[PDB]
Amino acid sequence: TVEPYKVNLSQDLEHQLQNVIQELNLEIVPPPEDPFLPVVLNLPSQRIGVVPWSPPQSNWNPWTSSNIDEGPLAYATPEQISMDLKNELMYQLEQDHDLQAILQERELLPVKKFESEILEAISQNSVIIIRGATGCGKTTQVPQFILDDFIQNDRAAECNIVVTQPRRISAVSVAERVAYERGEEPGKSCGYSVRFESVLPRPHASIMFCTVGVLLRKLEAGIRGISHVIVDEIHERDINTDFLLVVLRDVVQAYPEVRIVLMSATIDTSMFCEYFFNCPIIEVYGRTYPVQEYFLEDCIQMTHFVPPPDANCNLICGDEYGPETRMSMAQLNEKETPFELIEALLKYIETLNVPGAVLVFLPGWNLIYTMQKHLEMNPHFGSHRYQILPLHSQIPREEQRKVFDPVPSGVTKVILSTNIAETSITINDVVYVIDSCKQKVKLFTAHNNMTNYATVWASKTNLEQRKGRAGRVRPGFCFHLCSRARFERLETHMTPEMFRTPLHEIALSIKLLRLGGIGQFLAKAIEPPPLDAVIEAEHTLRELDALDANDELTPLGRILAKLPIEPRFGKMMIMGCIFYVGDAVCTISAATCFPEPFISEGKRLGYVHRNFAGNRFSDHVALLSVFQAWDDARMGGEEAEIRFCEHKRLNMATLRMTWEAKVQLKEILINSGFPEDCLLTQVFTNTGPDNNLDVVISLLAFGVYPNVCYHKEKRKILTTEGRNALIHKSSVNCPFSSQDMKYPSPFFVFGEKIRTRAISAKGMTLVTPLQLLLFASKKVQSDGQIVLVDDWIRLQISHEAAACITALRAAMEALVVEVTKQPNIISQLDPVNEHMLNMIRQISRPSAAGINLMIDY
Ligand SMILES: Nc1ncnc2c1ncn2[C@@H]1O[C@H](COP(=O)(O)OP(=O)(O)O)[C@@H](O)[C@H]1O
Ligand SMILES: CCn1nc(C(=O)Nc2cccc(NS(C)(=O)=O)c2)cc1C
Ligand SMILES: [Mg+2]
């Protein structure tokens, strides 16, 4: 219902645009004959493969994928290497009484009694499954059993083990734990490798813990110098793990000397067993105690709790309960987690007078933070009685480790945990579980580019696994916060991720690794993804020009396949290289992989954070400005860095991890033949004229498409599907109070469209209508006076200017194709290319759209 927006475009710029399109002989759609017929302005390599395998070799580092050339290990024999490592190990165990005591704890883990059986099963079979309760010792012990079996039988040199974990936090933490159990730190017998961080193991007799993504990205040259591949936690149905299971089944068939070990919680593993040619299953178990389970009804009755003022299963309650119980329950909204009942349940646990930790399953960091604040508002829950520790993947590792620590007598340890504590880790001392009965899942929808961090019901299987966490120490209690009539309607299993995740990154891996057709390869998965997801991945890669018309990998596609970020951000970074702003676009790209460095606490930003934005109405400009200020403050050394981050309320670990990620992305571009000088750090101002920053913001519009919106008033924006939405509270563009912002343009690009109670735009950058047309527009129809952009917004702008700006986009797209075939043409600064680039540089200026950001509006 919004009037066409008037673009203020000067006569000089209109003619410059016309001149550049004419000088470069670019094709333009002429103005229509009659208005009521409007016109759109928008107008190969030759066609199954197996990843090769090869066993460890004495002169080969399987982790660096290189020859050992310097030092003794180059020429040393397998026999020398093996006895040296055996002797070194024997001596360490003789001398180290703290290590001896660590080994004695190891030997009491339930998995220990199966050691012989596991090693016999692995030696005689290409593939096995190891199945047992969470906490038996599969993850920490089985790679050690295998390594120590080789070291003790004078074959240390013949053993290199890859262990895949479905989570970053698990790969790092397991490496640290297994190192500690071997009297070391990561970098010797154990190492880890996650997306933008590694500590490599030694080249011989060693275990690498990695994410599946890291391993797939390293498979271009094959699996070279590895004896064992252990795929951990298969029961989680992590999509990258399901995918790797397809790759490894082909590997096993063609190279039967490899050893594959799949490890699983107590689930039906028959599907995996059959998929891997009815491979043996080794059952692992130890002592478990019975656990009394309770539902929302029982929790209300036991605590006499009374609340304040799909079909609702809290209206259903059996008649063997009180009428206060049934009436109390009936007031509880199932879409909320009842924080006050959790408090009431903690006090009830005190009355049982049996010491033991309480594990509380909450969906995500949001409700954990909320539950924590809640309890610290009651001095009942102070240090004198309570140790309340948050467990989620974004808390530092020092804090994560604290959940294993013992507590002073008459203190209760309470863990507010994500589902990490479901099957991945075992917290000892747990006697009590409070189960929200919820999961956090990322649901994406391509049709409206909507992200939903949805709070959904857990499965029966998740409730069983959660209940069983209370029953490892003594008889236990599990308090399920769903009614008995919600339990009945729960699925048996969560949907595997393969059914509900975009596949374009897996599609690029399939093509980089030459495993054949995308649909063909995915049809061999243990549970193939739905047709529509495959069609959408192929459509996405074709639109990006990552695949040609024949669906073969382009030079562009190859680069995007080697970059561990969203392909569209990979293309944005290639464009930043061409414009000589590579370092800035690599910083924006890296930051999408990490939480916000602003410590804002889910409330509106204050003055200090807002000042990083300058006059650009841009969260992305705020981010680049904190990176510049922080990098400068770091020249003073560690304490100056720590004080900078404390005074400015910045998360230091986030800034450092993002910088490191930026460095690695830049390295992958350098090695793809991009020149050093297009990727140098460039000083910029966030208030004065800056053509480099102008271009970065143009390229950001490209990167985050189709996330464009139109500001109505206050916090209300219109999205591309015509619908209403809110400016996210955390944005520099969110009003601090009642004073209204005076945006010199109503057009905003943003990092993610979020579905909660309402639709929110988070990570918001103001763009001009020129930038909208150039980089945030797939389709533009003109009637001669008015243009319609992707059927949701109208601009009053000369037909010729809009047609010229569409031609610039097409020209830029064609340069990206040329630059990816030969990246060093960036260096040539060919004058026909520069003439087109300088015109994009010009229409990236606020002044091109009649905006001066230094003059208040
Ligand atoms: N960081 C740690 N601190 C203390 N104990 C730990 C740590 N990591 C693992 N453990 C303990 O090691 C044991 C075995 O864990 P794990 O190997 O993960 O078993 P599984 O893979 O069979 O679930 C558990 O009792 C667990 O608590
Ligand atoms: C180049 C140095 N480097 N390497 C890594 C890395 O994760 N390597 C890795 C991971 C898993 C397995 C293998 N070996 S393989 C392909 O299975 O044979 C190798 C990280 C860094 C900085
Ligand atoms: Mg495990």
In terms of domains, do 277 and 353 share one?
no
Header resolution in angstroms: 2.3
Is residue 404 lining ligand 1, measured as CB closer than 6 Å?
Answer: yes
Q: Long-range CB contacts (< 8 A, 24+ apart) of 512-519? A: 512/220, 512/553, 512/558, 512/561, 512/562, 513/49, 513/51, 513/216, 513/219, 513/220, 513/247, 514/49, 515/48, 515/49, 515/51, 515/247, 515/250, 516/48, 516/49, 517/551, 518/551
314 and 263 fall within a common domain: no
Q: Does residue 197 share a domain with residue 296?
A: no
Per the structure, the complete domain to which residue 313 belongs is given by 291-482
Ligand 3 centroid to Cα of residue 764, in Å, is: 40
Determine how β-strand 412-417 pairs with β-strand 357-361.
parallel
Let me know if residue 758 belongs to a domain. no
Which of 260, 284, 308 is the last residue before a domain boundary?
A: 284
Distance between CA atoms of 314 and 481, rounded to whole angstroms? 11
Domain count, the chain: 2
Could you tell me if 333 and 438 lie in one domain?
A: yes
Looking at residue 234, what DSSP letter applies?
G
Closest CA to 166 of 209, 197, 211, 207: 211
Domain harbouring 183, CATH code: 3.40.50.300
Which residues is 129 bridged to in the sheet?
Answer: 262, 281
Q: Which two tokens stand for residue 797?
A: 């702008």
User: Are residues 181 and 301 both part of a single domain?
Assistant: no
CA distance linking residue 241 with residue 497, whole number of Å? 10
Q: Which of 268, 284, 300 is the last residue of a domain?
A: 284
**Relative to the CA of 176, which ligand 1 atom is closest?**
1
Our answer on whether the CB atom of 135 is closer than 6 Å to any ligand 1 atom is: yes
User: Does 343 map to a domain?
Assistant: yes
Residue 8 token pair? 């203020």
Which amino acid residue places its CA nearest to atom 5 of ligand 1?
404
Cβ of 133 below 6 Å from ligand 2: no
Q: Which ligand is nearest to the CA of 160?
A: 2
Identity of the residue numbered 562:
K
- Same domain for 272 and 393? no
Clarify whether residues 278 and 323 are in a common domain.
no
Side chain identity at residue 469, one-letter code: R
Same domain? For 325 and 393 the reply is: yes
Residue 130, in any domain of the structure = yes
Cβ–ligand 2 distance for 666 under 6 Å, the answer no
Q: At what angle do helices 831-843 and 11-23 cross, to 10 degrees?
A: 150
| Choice from 193, 219, 240 to test ligand 2 binding pocket (greatest atom count within 8 A of CB) | 193
Whether residue 270 is found in the same domain as residue 318: no
Q: Closest-lying ligand to the alpha carbon of 208?
A: 2
Separation of 134 CA from ligand 3 center, angstroms? 6
Atom of ligand 1 nearest to the CA of 133: 22
Please give the backbone phi and psi of residue 508, each rounded to the nearest 5 degrees, phi first. Answer: -65, -40
Give the integer Cα–Cα distance in Å for 418 and 430: 15
By CB atoms closer than 10 A (0-12, 13-18, 19+), residue 492 is: exposed
**Count of beta carbons in the 10 Å neighbourhood of residue 556:** 23
**Residue 234 contacts residue 252 (beta carbons within 8 Å):** no
Four-residue CA torsion sign, 135, 137, 143, 146: negative
Bond before 706 cis per omega within 30 degrees: yes
Cα–Cα distance for residue pair 790/788, rounded to 1 Å = 7
CA distance 726 to 827: 43
**What whole-number distance in Å separates Cα of residue 784 and Cα of residue 356?**
75
In a domain, 278, yes or no: yes
Same domain, 170 and 196: yes
| Span between the terminal Cα atoms of the chain, in Å | 25
Structure tokens belonging to residue 540: 């996405």
Could you tell me if residue 850 is inside a domain?
no
* Same domain flag for 220 and 171: yes
Cα–Cα distance measured from residue 237 to residue 659, given in angstroms and rounded to the nearest whole number: 32
> Gap positions in the chain, given as the residue before each gap (C–N > 2.5 A)?
43, 47, 309
Name the closest-CA residue to atom 22, ligand 2.
198
402 lines ligand 1 (CB under 6 A): no
With a 6 Å cutoff on the Cβ, whether 195 touches ligand 2 is no
Q: Do the bridges between strand 708-713 and strand 747-755 make them parallel or antiparallel, or are there none, so unpaired?
A: antiparallel
CB atoms near residue 590 (< 10 Å): 24
Whether 383 is in a domain gets the answer yes
Answer whether 24's CB lies under 8 Å from 835's CB: yes
**Residues contacting 344, CB < 8 A, separation 6+:** 299, 303, 305
Q: How far apart are CA 646 and CA 364, in angstroms?
A: 26
d(CA 543, CA 706): 13
Name residues whose C-beta falls within 8 Å of residue 388's C-beta, 6 or more positions apart in sequence.
Answer: 372, 375, 376, 381, 414, 416
Which of the listed residues 255, 284, 313 is the one where a domain comes to its end? 284
**Which of 231, 398, 426 best tests ligand 1's pocket when mutated (most atoms within 8 Å of CB)?**
426
Residue nearest to atom 7 of ligand 1 (CA): 177
**Least distant ligand from the CA of 194:** 2
Angle at 577 between CA 575 and CA 580, to 5 degrees: 115
Q: Do 222 and 156 share a domain, yes or no?
A: yes
Do 797 and 9 touch, CB atoms closer than 8 A?
Answer: yes
Cα(147) to ligand 2 centroid in Å equals: 19
Q: What method did the depositors use to determine the structure?
A: X-ray
Count the Cβ atoms, other than its own, within 10 Å of residue 202. Answer: 15
Phi-psi region of 649 (alpha: psi -120 to 50; beta: other; left: phi over 0): left
**Is residue 595 one of the residues assigned to a domain?**
no
Ligand 2 atom closest to the CA of 226, numbered from 1: 18
In-domain check, residue 400 = yes
Which residue's CA lies nearest to atom 13 of ligand 2? 63
CB 426 less than 6 A from any atom of ligand 1: yes
CA-closest residue to ligand 2 atom 4: 64
